[PDB]
């Protein structure tokens, strides 16, 4: 009994953490694209603030 569940324990463990590695890198590209759209507004706000 204890070695039958030892089969099934590693097949629910592995598919959870192999999609966490999908989504831990998925957030790494959104927060570097959201900060790409935001920064290009910041360095054109400096010229909208300087000449006044």
């Amino acid at each position: 009994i204890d070695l039958e569940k030892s089969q099934q324990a590693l097949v629910q463990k592995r598919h959870y953490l192999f999609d966490v590695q999908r989504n831990n890198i998925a957030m790494a590209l959104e927060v570097t694209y959201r900060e790409r759209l935001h920064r290009v507004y910041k360095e054109i706000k400096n010229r909208l603030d300087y000449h006044i």
Binding site: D2, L3, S6, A9, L10
Partner: protein, 56 residues
């Protein structure tokens, strides 16, 4: 009485020690039965360790 001459019994004693080494050789020791329970425990524990290594 003080009997004599001895050519008798002593050749009929070593035929007897083919009998007594036949009967008493087929006996059973209670202790040997406690030894076979020990090796069955360590084998499945290593087999579970072979299953734990099949996990790890």
């Amino acid at each position: 009485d003080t009997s004599t001459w001895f050519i008798t019994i002593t050749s009929m004693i070593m035929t007897l020690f083919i009998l007594f080494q036949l009967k008493i050789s087929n006996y059973s020791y209670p202790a040997s039965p406690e030894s076979i329970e020990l090796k069955t425990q360590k084998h499945s524990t290593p087999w579970e360790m072979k299953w734990t290594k099949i996990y790890l």
